Design a protein around this ligand. Structure first.
Ligand code: AZA
Ligand code: AZA
Ligand code: AZA
Ligand code: AZA
Ligand code: NA
Ligand code: NA
Ligand code: NA
Ligand code: NA
Ligand code: XE
Ligand code: XE
Ligand code: XE
Ligand code: XE
Lengths: 295, 295, 295, 295
């Protein structure tokens, strides 16, 4: 037997950082969960019990804290690139670093109409994420994403004209509820290294904001012919607005809300145009994916 | 042996309702999870296999949907009271109904600065809840709550002057992070029945809003001497602003963020006044409770 | 306003302990999660910011580890009693301690048919729990429980003869699937103090084993007329076999498995006597409770 | 823009099936959660709102139930292959089916030392899984796995001789606790189609059993030099015992249990050879992966 692939590291490293403005007194907090896995010339730790090639996972944990102390942690694309570059430069035998970062929301509180200098609220479970792969001699590949953005519209969604055969019971509809949890990922052009990532820093937050804005507006305004058709429209617009993105991927559950026929009870009318009370379904759910690129 | 207490019913009944304004075209959605347990002269279903006394739990589920179709579902204190009253009036042998309702957030989206007529976002996992106990001959007892409101402040929290003995290692502090998930419950004066609950309908939403507002402002503005001291201040203000509340209860975790000493690494300074990077602790946590009433 | 009730402490304290037999070389592990909340003359910490009355929650955490180092941790009823007694005896102003313990399964592995001296498997998510309330001058109240015991039987469950009215759609049945997660609690006679708890130590493990055995046998063998009827039979037998128990409480979900009519597809027969494929329902579920005592 | 990849289908489809032996009266249950995603000539549903190419996800759900009614559901490798083959054969424009199946444990109860004909217990959260990719013209690729197998050993694990630099604080150790949740995957040789999968049916259950047995024995018996070294030994043995497997992959968290220094309290000795009470750490954790193949 032989080792065909191997990677190892530390997962679920929770990190908080505060910035304190000396002048204004305003404080800003960042909280993330970080995972770092390394690859390189480490096969002998598996095959011969040779621990001399292992950077201990505890040391990786230490490095994440030290790196956060010495560098900005925002935007996460930059922090991930700094952290990954560290490992491949510091250790001769380590040739790839894979860094995943989940950013948690701490939104500044408004009290009596003005922003508070040091108080924050978790205003949603929505996350902003990055996956950064730093590979020696091949640059830095970055995928940025948002996830856990849960939306619903109560009308202006249709679903008709689908294939019907002996396996089909679903009725065509011209008015249904549409609800999903949005997972959207944009993949950047390969960067040659840390200098190039630094040159594009302002684009990272701006592109996240654009992706979020396009997602929400398109969902609200599209008279949706299907999940497939609406998600394509979102991805098209994101690629149009940021030339440094190569592909956009959406993965969307279709979270079903079923009509409840109540006619059995005193002829009560609760279906079609009369539908007011619905039963949300926990499972099963549709799952619709697409990756859109440039032609 | 004898049956000392018994209750039974349906849990985890998910309900959605939409209201459609005919004039304006604006739609508003409500989504809840409902649990209803009944008590009464039902002992023989346990002791003698006598099912004739059982309102089937499936029928309770049907009743929740029918009741939601025929009545407003907001404020939840009113809906819960209507639903509980139904069971005790409809069935001679059922003498108590216990209704719990969890309300999920569907907040109207703003698109290009204006509110969308039919699109919504789950803008937080914070819940608004009610527990309603309808007991034949003893009226209606209502506890209203908010939960899952997660906050953090980065300074203006202290903790010093506590008992020190041979079990104490904790250092006194004049500046720490304070973070919690707020669970706050206000218990109303007993109501004689459904007419009295209806007479107070406008107070329910207003009191929820006040409780939320007082919680957030007090947390942001109090230079906190302890969790105990700050939570007392919140409860005091709520009782002062709504005379129909008899007690307020808070249950608050103290979610710890620990300093990380980095001095072992090149004399790096990251503690006390120099602390920038912290390690959030998933467990254990402090848990602090108090019920405040009128003197 | 006035403090009507208050308690505070540490939650989610994870503890592991190992015992190493010097002779045989056999090791045995225990893992628990512990919560301790105290009550007493502590109102001034809430009302006047007087921290001098507070045993810091960090110190409570320290005490749990020290107590586990110096005492046996099994049976959990004994460990909880020792831990609660400590707080009320050590601190003059603390008059009640409330200790909850969840025990996690680490079952010894059999390798090649024999028991391994030091290797363990989490063979189920089933828990054994205790709640111990130690109140100065009023002794020690102990409730022991098992929870998270998930079972299913595929036949020998019936449900017919229930109340039918204009809210009823459910069909009577003489053969259905029955599945539940068992939560069973037995409450001991009040003990005068730690000496009395020590005198009954052998009864604690034996009663847990009996409760488990009666639950499983009754479920497997009863041709069930309803959840209500079967659970009563379980509780009756437990009270009969241990005179030091005053009450038994069961709380049982009815986790539904629905028939799927497939007749629309080529006349396929999948209902009644022909039912083979079912759809498990995640929600809603029945919830059935009963507390049985001595007559 | 252009569609670069697309797949869609139904997730979280819960299925139960019962087999009833007419002679013996013995019943056997199977419960699974199934996900099916399709690929093919479906781009126009995204780009032109052309629903004529869409097999509705509701119809996929129907097909899973029908297929389970007409075919055996065990071993899951066979059921997944039948289900995937159906879609590519039935629909001309669908060219790939991806089927994931999670099998839940329903273990037959022993009552009074003998096996019960119709009663079952969920004896662990451990799962048996399959991923089956059926691609038109390229056969059937099957990855089988077990997951959620949680183990701990209290001694006979070491970790010393690792790289030490200015980022290292971890002390070398010759005796520590080792605990993990095992995720192991074995990938089969490509099969030409359903006839070939049928020819190997007996190997599927036997190989799962072997993989489980090797995992448990190796973990219990290896005086572990590192997670890396022990996991390699497991994978080596599995490949040796089943020639139809091409690769084995393990993904293993290192779930840390930390010593607690209690010397601050009355010189209490709880570290090194005196360590009895430990603090399990919820996070962070090591994460160690390896894919082993044939040389
Ligand atoms: O938008 C949808 N796309 C689909 O593929 C589908 N299948 N059922 N409902 C559906 N809705
Ligand atoms: O506010 C606090 N109250 C307490 O009781 C406590 N114990 N440790 N830290 C603490 N903080
Ligand atoms: O055992 C049962 N008890 C009940 O009260 C009930 N209601 N629906 N199905 C039921 N089954
Ligand atoms: O087995 C281990 N492998 C590792 O890479 C490691 N790092 N810290 N502890 C460890 N244990
Ligand atoms: Na390198
Ligand atoms: Na009544
Ligand atoms: Na005392
Ligand atoms: Na095809
Ligand atoms: Xe969508
Ligand atoms: Xe607080
Ligand atoms: Xe039961
Ligand atoms: Xe391992």
């Amino acid at each position: 037997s032989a080792v065909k692939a191997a990677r190892y590291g530390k997962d679920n490293v929770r990190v908080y950082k505060v910035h304190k403005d000396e002048k204004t007194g305003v404080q800003t907090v960042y909280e993330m969960t970080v995972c770092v896995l390394l690859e390189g010339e480490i096969e002998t730790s598996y095959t011969k019990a040779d621990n001399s090639v292992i950077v201990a996972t505890d040391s990786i944990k230490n490095t994440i804290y030290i790196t956060a102390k010495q560098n900005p942690v925002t935007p996460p694309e930059l922090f991930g690139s700094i952290l990954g570059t560290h490992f491949i430069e510091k250790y001769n035998h380590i040739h790839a670093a894979h860094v995943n970062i989940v950013c948690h929301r701490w939104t500044r509180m408004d009290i009596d109409g003005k922003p508070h200098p040091h108080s924050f609220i978790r205003d949603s479970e929505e996350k902003r994420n990055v996956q950064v792969d730093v590979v020696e001699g091949k640059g830095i590949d970055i995928k940025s994403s948002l996830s856990g953005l849960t939306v619903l519209k109560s009308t202006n969604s249709q679903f008709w004209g689908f294939l019907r055969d002996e396996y089909t019971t679903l009725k065509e509809t011209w008015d249904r509820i549409l609800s999903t949890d949005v997972d959207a990922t944009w993949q950047w052009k390969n960067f040659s290294g840390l200098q190039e990532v630094r040159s594009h820093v302002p684009k990272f937050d701006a592109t996240w904001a654009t992706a979020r804005e396009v997602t929400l507006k398109t969902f609200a305004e599209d008279n949706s012919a299907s999940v497939q058709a609406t998600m394509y429209k979102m991805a098209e617009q994101i690629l149009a607005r940021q030339q440094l993105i190569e592909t956009v991927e959406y993965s969307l559950p279709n979270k079903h809300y079923f009509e409840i026929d109540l006619s059995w009870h005193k002829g009560l009318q609760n279906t079609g145009k009369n539908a007011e009370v619905f039963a949300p379904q926990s499972d099963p759910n549709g799952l619709i994916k697409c990756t859109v690129g440039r032609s």
